[PDB]
């Protein structure tokens, strides 16, 4: 009955996936119940004691928030700046790739996993330019 | 089958290579399928529960952006500083030994592994100059 959680990283042609869990990256096989094609990068995946992906839910809603600096030319990574001016090159999740992200946008990230899940609207920038 | 990952440090003629994983370095033998000479410095390897190097690859993930200060005499190690003015020497990877390196170039590094993997293009330029 007890089942853990992990962060999906990428998909492989061997019907295998990379899962970040307990601060470590592991190679896992999707269960026959789920379809490996429907999986998306950065999506939370439910694991088990046998280390098998059995269900994928939505994306994480809590964690750190960082300021976006730039989007790399490859289109799958973004350079952002942490709270103490620490700079990280983090993967972009599927929802991030409205308008395309611009420098200065705030992204919800978890540094250990290294993914940007959601653009978080800021009230200060909205208040600066009155409408 | 579940499996983990590690970072390759060096290769020896004894068909044994040094791999950093789980926060520690171990000298392990490679599988017969893979070729020892084919492996390069600074690239990832895939381990197993028996710790057998079965698959190769390259490292492309997050990392604290480090400012390169200078290149040492031997030409295989580089001095980099971090956000907290922490100076440390790191082994250069194969793809960095490309344009000639210069002081102040941003680099992608793994502090636990001590390897610089790639040079991140400057954010202050690309996000603005392009049109």
Curated annotation (Swiss-Prot), chains A, B:
Effect annotated for changing residue 112 to A: Does not dramatically affect proteasome substrate degradation
Effect of residue 122 to E: Impairs Mpa hexamerization
Recorded phenotype for the gene knockout or disruption: Cells lacking this gene accumulate pupylated proteins. These cells also become hypersensitive to reactive nitrogen intermediates (RNI) and are severely attenuated in both wild-type and nitric oxide synthase 2 deficient mice. Moreover, they display increased resistance to hydrogen peroxide.
Post-translation changes: Mpa thus promotes its own turnover. Mpa is a target of RNI, thereby is S-nitrosylated in the phagosome of immunologically activated host macrophages, which causes enzyme inhibition.
UniProt domain comment: Consists of three main regions, an N-terminal coiled-coil domain (residues 1-96) that binds to protein Pup and functions as a docking station, an interdomain (residues 97-245) involved in Mpa hexamerization, and a C-terminal ATPase domain of the AAA type (residues 246-609).
UniProt similarity note: Belongs to the AAA ATPase family.
Extra facts: Was identified as a natural substrate of the M.tuberculosis proteasome.
Oligomer and partners: Homohexamer. Assembles into a hexameric ring structure that caps the 20S proteasome core. Strongly interacts with the prokaryotic ubiquitin-like protein Pup through a hydrophobic interface; the interacting region of Mpa lies in its N-terminal coiled-coil domain. There is one Pup binding site per Mpa hexamer ring; the K(D) measured is about 3.8 uM. Upon ATP-binding, the C-terminus of Mpa interacts with the alpha-rings of the proteasome core, possibly by binding to the intersubunit pockets.
Task of the protein: ATPase which is responsible for recognizing, binding, unfolding and translocation of pupylated proteins into the bacterial 20S proteasome core particle. May be essential for opening the gate of the 20S proteasome via an interaction with its C-terminus, thereby allowing substrate entry and access to the site of proteolysis. Thus, the C-termini of the proteasomal ATPase may function like a 'key in a lock' to induce gate opening and therefore regulate proteolysis.
Name used for this protein in its record: Proteasome-associated ATPase
Organism: Mycobacterium tuberculosis (strain ATCC 25618 / H37Rv)
Residues of the full protein shown: 97 to 244 of 609
